[model samples]
Target: GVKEWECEVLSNKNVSTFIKEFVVKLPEGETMNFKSGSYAQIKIPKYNIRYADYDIQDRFRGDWDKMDAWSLTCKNEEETVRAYSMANYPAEGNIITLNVRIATPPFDRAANKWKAGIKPGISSSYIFSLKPGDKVMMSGPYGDFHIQDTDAEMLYIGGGAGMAPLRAQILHLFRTLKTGRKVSYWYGARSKNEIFYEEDFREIEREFPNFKFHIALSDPQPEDNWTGYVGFIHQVIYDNYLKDHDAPEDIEYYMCGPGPMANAVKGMLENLGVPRNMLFFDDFG
Candidate 1:
């Protein structure tokens, strides 16, 4: 039943230095009901120059009219699609929210080199440019990354712009379901400016005795003077929680973050003898 829907932007605002929280309204009389941690394939139009009849007609000796119609009808040239996770659990009937991070050139972790000067992502750049009333094509509530139905203690690991789906799941657990199960979130960012939704999660923590929120900074600047956890999130998690825990395998882990960070935590969890089914991940680097 997943299909393309034309959605209109209701609001788009910066939630962090590089992340934008985008809310869109689905077409009238329609809804995209989905679970937490689902993602939508977002598409933005991009115009491109197509071939002219005169240039290829004579060389191919084919029907120019047919070629022209085929070129215009394909429509693939006009759009770029990318997957973005929903930032909230299903609440409004025809509304969806997403957290988009402007994607720049990536760091090659293996080589320890930065690939500078490369062009930013076309889809993400276009998303950042959108305003209210702008139309975007989106398809499906795709992905099978929702939290499992259990009473086990939960550990959520998220980083960078990978906060969307994790936020959705957390909100669902505390705000919607009002679950009493113990849950802890360990989020990592490069600096203080990059960390977002601090008060929102802290408010939830204050309300729910079973919930805990922790933030880690991998690269804190001198001006920030952060007194909290400093280092990669995986290290902080191990030192602060897992090292002193009684039984890690009894807990459920839901991780959403950059590929390398997810892999690092996954590697650590596996080494600790956590069962594969006890872990869930949504990697978007």
Candidate 2:
């Protein structure tokens, strides 16, 4: 008797950016084994970024020495690229998933790959190009963004691709039934069309009594038909949610997003009397 497993790319859809879903078929009763909150290094056989290795040190900020939660370089004969942490858990199936946002003007030659009309720049895009049966090498299950133990309640704020780690935390909480503490998630998007994981969070809210999820849309067009919270995420948090909530002493805030949004949220939290120590953010511009 022999055991076997298979994986395939199920679909690739553009969600604000390009998001590709890979499906893995494992033995009927066997679970995929990998540490969540880690990164896997996959080499892009095609287009490669020339100077990606140069920025590796600055990106890891000396954490590269510890070899934890840092980017690993993978290259063939020509070029290399670095993959950053997008999630905090080990992927469950044979197929690993990656979400990539295309770069904009003043195009980064090292990152932007122009072929025909579909430009694939990020490392994930290269990974997505692999055929159904192709084998890719990867290393990781590293990072310091895992959940922490604290007496205070938890507040998760994020936008764009920031949902990666936050979603992992929510799923972990749901699976563990750890409801001794309160948790709230305020997710922001440009408009209704840009929202992600709405249904998933809704179901999680139903299952977990201590958890609350909110979506805020900024600059929602007239046709969006959004009736929830309409404004900057920081404003919505200040005007609606955080206004009624207690000060910094009562909660631990975790935020991840673009620099501007994260900074806005930080300022709002401080304005509401949140202590500096109570706020934690991972800001990437």
Supply the TM-score for candidate 1.
0.82
**Stretches of candidate 2 above 4 Å error?**
1-10, 17-38, 46-78, 86-95, 106-135
Query: Model 1 misses residue 6 by how many Å?
Result: 1.7
lDDT by residue for model 2 (100-195), tens: 443321323564332224333456545534445445444343455655677678888988777766766666666554556788999998877667
Q: List the residue pairs that clash in candidate 2.
A: 36-89, 36-90, 37-88, 37-89, 38-141, 38-142, 41-139
How many steric overlaps are in each model, in order? 0, 7
Q: TM-scores for all candidates?
A: 0.82, 0.70
Tell me the deviation in Å of residue 171 in model 2: 0.7
For model 1, residues 60-123, the per-residue Cα lDDT tens digits are 2232253222232112345667899998777655789899876644655665443534444667
Give the top-scoring candidate (lDDT): 1
How far is 171's C-alpha from truth in model 1 (Å)? 0.6
